[PDB]
Amino acid sequence: MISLIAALAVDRVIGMENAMPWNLPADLAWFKRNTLNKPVIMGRHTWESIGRPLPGRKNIILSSQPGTDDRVTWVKSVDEAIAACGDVPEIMVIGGGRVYEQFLPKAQKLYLTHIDAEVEGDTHFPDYEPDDWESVFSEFHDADAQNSHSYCFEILERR
Numbered sequence: 001m002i003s004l005i006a007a008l009a010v011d012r013v014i015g016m017e018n019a020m021p022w023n024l025p026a027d028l029a030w031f032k033r034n035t036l037n038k039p040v041i042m043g044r045h046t047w048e049s050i051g052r053p054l055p056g057r058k059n060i061i062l063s064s065q066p067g068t069d070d071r072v073t074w075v076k077s078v079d080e081a082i083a084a085c086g087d088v089p090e091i092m093v094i095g096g097g098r099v100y101e102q103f104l105p106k107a108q109k110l111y112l113t114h115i116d117a118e119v120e121g122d123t124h125f126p127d128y129e130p131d132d133w134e135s136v137f138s139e140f141h142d143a144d145a146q147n148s149h150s151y152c153f154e155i156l157e158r159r
């Protein structure tokens with residue numbers, strides 16, 4: 001099973017100048033809980049944005065060019081990325097925009113955080129078709145001293 005996990009600001013913005021400009025510790029904790037002990041697939045730009053391997057997860061990087069770091073696994077196509085995960089129950093695709101586009105048709109589950117924040121970005125989560133997806137979990141949180149915007153954790157499953 002393939003799942004996508006992402007945090008979206010207003011208008012499905014997910015990034016700006018290869019960075020995420022907000023800081024929402026509660027959402028990063030949600031990301032860690034839902035990805036720990038699973039393989040994570042990311043594109044090369046997202047690998048550069050994170051800047052280090054994510055511990056406790058098999059890190060698989062998509063790139064058309066040879067890898068430059070043997071602490072992670074480098075693959076050259078979607079099918080190779082999936083194969084490199086082995087026989088696991090759930091593969092987590094962690095972006096970015098181009099990678100989300102390619103894996104969305106193959107995904108059964110979306111873990112989405114909706115952040116009530118406006119930021120002028122250059123990368124968006126794919127337009128998906130709402131009729132294809134059922135909301136099975138949602139949890140709203142107001143802003144607090146640690147998290148400066150309100151946010152909503154949602155899990156969608158393909159109908």
Ligand SMILES: NC(=O)c1ccc[n+]([C@@H]2O[C@H](COP(=O)([O-])OP(=O)(O)OC[C@H]3O[C@@H](n4cnc5c(N)ncnc54)[C@H](OP(=O)(O)O)[C@@H]3O)[C@@H](O)[C@H]2O)c1
Nearest residue numbers: 006007015018019043044045046063064095096097098099
């Ligand atoms: N808010 C969130 O949830 C979230 C999550 C992830 C990322 N982001 C943000 O998203 C942005 C990065 O997204 P992005 O769309 O620019 O890039 P990306 O999807 O992270 O990376 C794209 C790169 O991945 C490689 N790639 C993708 N598909 C491939 C394929 N089928 N075969 C081989 N290589 C493939 C290519 O690398 P080569 O050029 O080396 O061939 C391509 O240039 C950043 O702003 C980051 O902060 C946000």
Ligand SMILES: Nc1nc(=O)c2nc(CNc3ccc(C(=O)N[C@@H](CCC(=O)O)C(=O)O)cc3)cnc2[nH]1
Nearest residue numbers: 005006007027028029031032050054055094095113
């Ligand atoms: N909901 C969601 N939020 C995100 O921030 C997110 N980020 C990415 C890509 N970028 C990043 C950037 C940093 C870390 C990171 O530092 N993660 C630590 C945080 C642990 C914690 O804060 O408790 C990790 O071990 O996962 C992960 C992904 C992909 N999907 C996402 N999905």
Ligand SMILES: [Mn+2]
Nearest residue numbers: 077078079080
């Ligand atoms: Mn092929």
Ligand SMILES: [Mn+2]
Nearest residue numbers: 083086087088
């Ligand atoms: Mn197999």
Ligand SMILES: [Mn+2]
Nearest residue numbers: 116117149150
């Ligand atoms: Mn806000």
